[PDB]
Design a binder for this molecule. Structure first.
Ligand SMILES: NC(=O)c1ccc[n+]([C@@H]2O[C@H](COP(=O)([O-])OP(=O)(O)OC[C@H]3O[C@@H](n4cnc5c(N)ncnc54)[C@H](O)[C@@H]3O)[C@@H](O)[C@H]2O)c1
Ligand SMILES: NC(=O)c1ccc[n+]([C@@H]2O[C@H](COP(=O)([O-])OP(=O)(O)OC[C@H]3O[C@@H](n4cnc5c(N)ncnc54)[C@H](O)[C@@H]3O)[C@@H](O)[C@H]2O)c1
Ligand SMILES: NC(=O)c1ccc[n+]([C@@H]2O[C@H](COP(=O)([O-])OP(=O)(O)OC[C@H]3O[C@@H](n4cnc5c(N)ncnc54)[C@H](O)[C@@H]3O)[C@@H](O)[C@H]2O)c1
Ligand SMILES: NC(=O)c1ccc[n+]([C@@H]2O[C@H](COP(=O)([O-])OP(=O)(O)OC[C@H]3O[C@@H](n4cnc5c(N)ncnc54)[C@H](O)[C@@H]3O)[C@@H](O)[C@H]2O)c1
Ligand SMILES: NC(=O)c1ccc[n+]([C@@H]2O[C@H](COP(=O)([O-])OP(=O)(O)OC[C@H]3O[C@@H](n4cnc5c(N)ncnc54)[C@H](O)[C@@H]3O)[C@@H](O)[C@H]2O)c1
Ligand SMILES: NC(=O)c1ccc[n+]([C@@H]2O[C@H](COP(=O)([O-])OP(=O)(O)OC[C@H]3O[C@@H](n4cnc5c(N)ncnc54)[C@H](O)[C@@H]3O)[C@@H](O)[C@H]2O)c1
Ligand SMILES: O=C(O)c1cc(Cc2ccc(O)c(C(=O)O)c2)ccc1O
Ligand SMILES: O=C(O)c1cc(Cc2ccc(O)c(C(=O)O)c2)ccc1O
Ligand SMILES: O=C(O)c1cc(Cc2ccc(O)c(C(=O)O)c2)ccc1O
Lengths: 551, 551, 551
């Protein structure tokens, strides 16, 4: 590359970080303003401009423009101030941007695969320029978090997600590929407007869609190898669950909604058992719902109990999921699926028909809001649990705040501060009237998915087992220091997520080599140095050709 | 070109206007959303988005983003709604954008030539990709209209100007080259901030700057030929005037501030003499100032009088410029330069020291606000002139409105509507209490410079004489219809400027061939068809390779 | 790629195999003659042209021109008729071409690394376009086979060699890299002429040369990985031997002169023991020389004896190398190096000072001409051995024919046809007066090095052990059929070398996985299908973009 295409390419574009000698040798002289700036000046300038803006959507437009222009400076900006720019880059600002502005990308991002393109997906994959990609994020747009069906406009969900992949873990930006598979949109408003950008049919739910998914995965693994990591982001619950079950064995697929959330919740529980004297195996758990997400969380919990030596049956006896119809129990009138069969225990005497009565009779030590039907955790049940348990553990995993089962402020104020609270939604620190301000921990998947993805990429793992996420949860819990536990935090601070992700990767990497699930050989003697070398560094590299004189 | 670089190039980028067969043959399949859109849908979408925005600066950012992304659609948007988007694209929104946001261009535009690059300007010119350029706009940034010195941030002034070159005249976008020559900035604020993007020295006024201008013009004419049209935009008054005088003979240079404004004012005067019974040669003129701009206007006026057969001396006797010190008169104590010597007439008896008394004694038929010292046209002098003349002609050429000598509303209301008013600043229609709403004509250079530039480009003219602008003014006046003259308008509507510009070009082209100043041979038999063929059309052209089967 | 660069690139160039639709879609229409030809017509045409030529050097020029023009057709031509074109492409015609015509390549081939470029070898390696290379052949030019020192003109030796890598094994042409390291030339004639193309200094033998080799290997392994296969071709005996010893452990290096020749000779010996009733371990061996080449051959022989269960000491007792001074024996006046110490046996009673007397007393069953001092195998010693042994085994590994120790015709005629003869030099079939025409087997490294290289490339082997070549020799011997052994052939025919090489690779691959020396995981269940899939196929692949119509 030379001349103008050097700046036009975001991978190699330096803005004004092009030194004078670089400008003169590479033919960039005269096409740039006379000033020469280090990357620090560039980042400071864009941080000032970002501080000027006041709305998260405007910040999103600005930061994505920076990404389309210069990627290395964009990632330095993102890594430099990551706690404040993470909501802008991934969630929930991406949903709002996709809904209101639709498609904003002034540059080709990822691939658009349609059901009209069935039978020829391999050519579409061949059209993608990058020869080696390691991570692929696939979206259907059917279930955008909090916005329902956006159709083809959900392509911002993978791209933003991939930014985190590079901002936290260190995966190279050119090894990532965001893919949007659109089979139509289900909402009327998108079907009606003339400026919708995609198929105008209603969403296709026939065998054609399943065959399209099969063909796409086969084509991507044919071009990029069997060990390419493919992640299904924001599919429908039915589609995502079924596709994870179908492709988990064949391909290197892990789903963040099902598996990452279980890892984050289990990490919170391990932090709680580090704070509370009693262990996890001693105390029983009550779930708000019983679905494959809830079954995944309970499976991680029972695995964590088993690894400590306690028997699988005794560990399963602890969890008592509660369905929509009622408490999950043997002989119940309501149907019981095979997956939720293991947590089907003996009948309680009352057989309560309400959740509050269920807490009253069962007297659980931990409560988990996995059902997400809405604002289910009433103050009455919270007070009942606080009476039952000395230090109750309350989890409200659903987001946003309105959809959450409980509010951190109410949960902390209603009790005397004894409860341990962790929620998916972000909440500000809560200060009681007497004092003792409490900061509710926030558990989001950004803790887990980047580090696990980096470890799987580096280890050339072909099958992502369910125990990998247990190891990741243990690593995430071990990240916490003693003083953080004393403060009452259950998760490491998001201000220094990058190192956390790196550490997580290390642990997973060691596990992947201990259990013969990693196919990158020779096995490194030290995993930490190997992963720290493999990571991407967002620092400009000189393009000056080496000039010397022969003797 | 094939694949991704086809979209990355704004010249060849089509957005979703890429037909399905084009996407499949050229390898764009899968990189675009599934929808295929004609250019009309694209323009409608962007017009709706533009209507959503409410501030002219936001509109400027949006439209320039469109230009950086897809140029043909940008020019269709600009030509489609040109009256409302012309203030956004060129003036005064470009000044505000350059002042507040500095440099916003996410793509290389034009060239940046600095005084530190002296001695090597030819290499900088060689760095520019386009092999053939016909028009060059050079800015120094010293005098941005209404904003003083912006230093290197004035580069938005050429680029926006060049948009008009393509939006009105039809000059090809790739034949244009915006050049910013920065020799430092004079204002302290730009020198002080760390994020200024250019030289941190104070503006250089020595022989080095003149030699840099000489070298730049020599280098540009060496690479692109002697007939390359070079225009000095927004230099300092001293620098622009001196450089026009120096390079007018050697190179194909015309300055819009000096020569285009004279053409527009003379066109307004010709429209006035079409409205008013009396001819131009019969009535005398009084100027608010006497400078090379005022001398250029008066020179155009005397040329127009001469071409009608009236002697040069008699024509010169009519104009009576008024200096800052006082009325320009022979034997005056104040200095008289050689250029303003011809309009130095016999002493009036009063020798008035104030402008109002000057109007009272001289009793001019026409008044022209070329001095622009500020709000000089008092209501008293306006009433005095309206008493003197049955239908006074009042010109307030200075802009913005605050800097204008008079307000169109006040000028029309104060008189009974008899006056003919034309101003550089845009004014809304003025409706009197009794009735008879009057729309003051607005005279801006966008009438003249695009068509003249197109004619000069097509005719391969090496020297732009001063009579070319007289011919252009006559053409612009002839554009007006009888009903428009009856309404009181002095200029053609800006809604249909494009055709106006085309017509202007035709006339100039004919003149350039009648006076042996055009070097494009063979001379076309009909100039209209020649120019209408040569113009650029902002319509997508199919990239499909021709596929046929041999017999 | 599109248009003219598609033909200019030999990798993607098809000549007239471009179908009409390919020409029309890819923009090649009109740049090619109207005819459309399959690859068969192209190969037939070039075979006819090749038959017209009469001198091997002219054939070499023609075939290398074809390679520079279209590589896939060149490799189809080479594979189609490989027995006759192998002498043209690699040996000995490459030496003659390099000597007489110097550098003939009209296209950049490989890299030229000079000692003046020391300290900056990494930049030179970075200049090479191909991102992934698997095989590297490095030449110094000091010892070209039969032509001494050619300096920088020896670059034809790697390139031609790499052709075999693709013609026999199936290694992709773009994964190969020929490198010529020139530290000067030692011969006066090249130093004297003005048109020599390289350094005009005498060959550098100081520490600078060793440091240059170290730096080059480090730079190549840094860019292309630790498992890149690097082969030292035609270095000096001292330099090649020392560099193999030094870099065998660190890098994936195998030397054909030392290790491949041992494998070929051992394969001949195994074919002999399949023809002769007695086993290898039963009969003793006498060598003409004792050097690291002879020690390598004897090491392969003792390994082959050991793998059959016979003890290492007993196996070593069999080989009796004969030095230049005299028979290698304990207590000898002449110096004995550490490497040749194991084959230092008890003193014979005569202690013969001549080779004929050595054969007379020792009465060896096998004789091997590894010394290559010249025409050493006198008819007297041949008759003596034929009297000693019922079916003597005579090996003349040195080439060319004049340098050979014996002539196949003389060896076969002098005995009654009982002897088994294998020589490096090619010899025509020898027909005795009574009858029974005998075809002497020819043992050249082209049997071994391509298949071993392919197996090492596919298995990602980091260290090439000495037992790999023993396994390769066993595979090569097992290639022979029973009827071929009955005919008296010791090596498979060269007409079908490709499949032979493939089979060799398979065996080596299995060995590399059986001994945990292969780092490509997951380990394939069947090695044969894996290697047969991985090989390069010299068949044109359609460049037509997939064109379909959406429903
Ligand atoms: N200027 C460049 O862009 C540049 C320079 C050097 C190397 N590379 C890349 O290094 C690769 C060589 O692989 P290796 O020797 O490191 O294998 P490795 O053994 O070190 O790693 C094993 C796997 O992990 C992948 N991987 C390693 N680091 C990664 C990262 N930061 N992000 C995402 N994936 C990562 C690798 O692609 C590889 O497949 C080349 O394919 C090449 O693409 C690129
Ligand atoms: N990306 C994330 O942050 C993430 C991840 C996992 C789960 N979740 C949460 O899980 C929920 C959806 O996941 P899912 O797999 O469980 O859905 P699902 O369709 O598989 O099943 C929902 C379960 O909730 C139970 N339930 C529903 N309403 C109930 C009610 N009013 N009272 C008692 N039980 C009720 C149902 O019995 C059912 O078993 C959402 O709230 C979602 O916020 C979020
Ligand atoms: N796909 C394309 O981009 C394309 C196709 C055809 C021709 N062209 C251009 O046409 C030019 C051939 O010149 P010609 O035969 O028309 O000479 P001409 O006699 O018709 O015109 C005389 C001069 O006017 C210039 N000119 C003509 N039209 C112009 C326009 N719309 N905008 C700006 N300048 C214009 C020309 O460059 C020429 O120098 C080529 O240099 C080539 O750059 C471009
Ligand atoms: N781009 C445009 O629209 C354009 C073009 C031409 C001229 N102008 C107007 O011309 C003016 C500057 O051009 P210029 O070449 O004449 O400047 P200049 O420096 O060459 O001379 C200014 C003239 O104005 C006279 N003058 C100044 N103040 C006066 C006062 N209070 N009373 C009477 N006379 C006074 C002076 O005698 C002097 O001759 C600006 O108002 C500018 O708006 C604008
Ligand atoms: N159109 C093309 O040029 C094209 C198409 C597909 C794949 N490829 C190549 O396939 C490679 C993917 O490697 P893989 O999935 O086959 O790994 P693999 O597990 O099948 O093989 C292991 C190693 O052997 C190498 N190798 C395989 N076949 C080879 C051959 N015929 N010649 C020389 N070396 C060979 C590979 O580079 C790899 O490093 C890509 O790097 C890419 O360069 C090229
Ligand atoms: N590329 C090939 O085909 C290939 C491969 C290996 C060996 N060779 C042959 O080996 C020879 C060189 O290899 P090297 O490593 O053995 O050289 P070397 O320098 O390492 O040693 C040569 C050996 O030959 C012995 N010798 C020399 N002259 C002798 C004589 N007149 N009588 C008895 N013994 C004598 C010497 O004692 C010495 O040990 C060449 O003939 C060469 O053709 C060829
Ligand atoms: O490399 C650099 O630092 C660099 C920075 C800028 C400033 C800029 C960029 C994007 C924007 O959206 C806005 C804005 O709109 O304020 C401003 C321009 C050119 C550059 O080369
Ligand atoms: O070609 C097209 O029509 C096309 C249009 C869009 C929409 C768009 C572009 C720029 C914007 O700034 C905004 C916004 O910010 O609202 C939106 C995106 C991709 C396309 O390919
Ligand atoms: O692709 C093809 O078949 C093809 C073949 C030829 C013939 C040819 C090539 C090389 C030569 O050296 C000689 C000669 O010298 O006789 C002749 C020319 C153009 C082609 O496109």
């Amino acid at each position: 590359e030379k001349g103008k295409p050097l700046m036009l390419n975001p991978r190699t574009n330096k803005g004004m970080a092009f030194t004078l000698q670089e400008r003169q040798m590479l033919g960039l002289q005269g096409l740039l303003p006379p000033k020469i700036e280090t990357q620090d000046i560039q980042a400071l300038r864009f941080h000032r401009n970002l501080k000027k803006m006041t709305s998260p959507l405007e910040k999103y437009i600005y930061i994505m423009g920076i990404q389309e222009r210069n990627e290395k400076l964009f990632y330095r900006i993102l890594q430099d101030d990551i706690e404040s720019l993470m909501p802008i880059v991934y969630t929930p600002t991406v949903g709002l941007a996709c809904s209101q502005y639709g498609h904003i990308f002034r540059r080709p991002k990822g691939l658009f695969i349609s059901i009209s393109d069935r039978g020829h997906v391999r050519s579409i994959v061949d059209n993608w320029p990058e020869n080696h990609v390691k991570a692929v994020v696939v979206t259907d747009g059917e279930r955008i978090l909090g916005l329902g069906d956006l159709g083809v406009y959900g392509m911002g969900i993978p791209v933003g997600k991939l930014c985190l992949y590079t901002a936290c873990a260190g995966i190279r930006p050119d090894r990532c590929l965001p893919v949007c598979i659109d089979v139509g949109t289900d909402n009327i408003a998108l079907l009606k407007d003339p400026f919708y950008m995609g198929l105008y049919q209603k969403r296709d739910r026939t065998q054609q869609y399943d065959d399209l998914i099969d063909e796409f995965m086969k084509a991507i693994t044919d071009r990029y190898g069997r060990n390419t990591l493919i992640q299904f982001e924001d599919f429908g619950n039915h589609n995502a669950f079924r596709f994870l079950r179908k492709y988990r064995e064949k391909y290197c697929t892990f789903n963040d909604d099902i598996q990452g959330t279980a890892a984050v919740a289990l990490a919170g529980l391990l932090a709680a058992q580090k704070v509370i004297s009693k262990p996890i195996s001693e105390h029983k758990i009550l779930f708000l719902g019983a679905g494959e997400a809830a079954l995944g969380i309970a499976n991680l919990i029972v695995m964590s109990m088993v690894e400590n030596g306690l028997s699988e049956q005794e560990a399963q006896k602890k969890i008592w999921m509660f369905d929509k119809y009622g408490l999950l129990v043997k002989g119940r009138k309501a149907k019981i699926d095979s997956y939720q069969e293991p947590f089907t225990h003996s009948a309680p005497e009352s057989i309560p028909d309400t959740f509050e009565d269920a807490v009253n009779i069962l007297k659980p030590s931990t409560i988990i809001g996995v059902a997400g039907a809405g604002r289910l955790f009433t103050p009455d049940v919270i007070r009942a649990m606080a009476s039952i348990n000395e230090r109750p553990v309350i989890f409200a995993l659903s987001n946003p705040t309105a959809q959450a089962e409980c509010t951190a402020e109410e949960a902390y104020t209603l009790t005397e501060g004894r409860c341990l609270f962790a929620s998916g939604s972000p909440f500000g620190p809560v200060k009681l009237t007497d004092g003792r301000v409490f900061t509710p921990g926030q558990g989001n998947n950004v803790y887990i998915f980047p580090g696990v993805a980096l470890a799987v990429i580096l280890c050339n793992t072909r099958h992502i087992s369910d125990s990998v996420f247990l190891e990741a949860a243990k690593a995430l819990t071990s990240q916490l220091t003693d003083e953080e536990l004393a403060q009452g935090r259950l998760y490491p601070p998001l201000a220094n997520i990058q190192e956390v992700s790196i550490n997580i990767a290390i642990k997973v990497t060691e596990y992947l080599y201990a259990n013969k699930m990693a196919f990158r050989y020779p096995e490194p003697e030290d995993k930490a140095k190997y992963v720290k070398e493999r990571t991407w560094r967002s620092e400009y590299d000189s393009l000056l050709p080496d000039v010397y004189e022969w003797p």
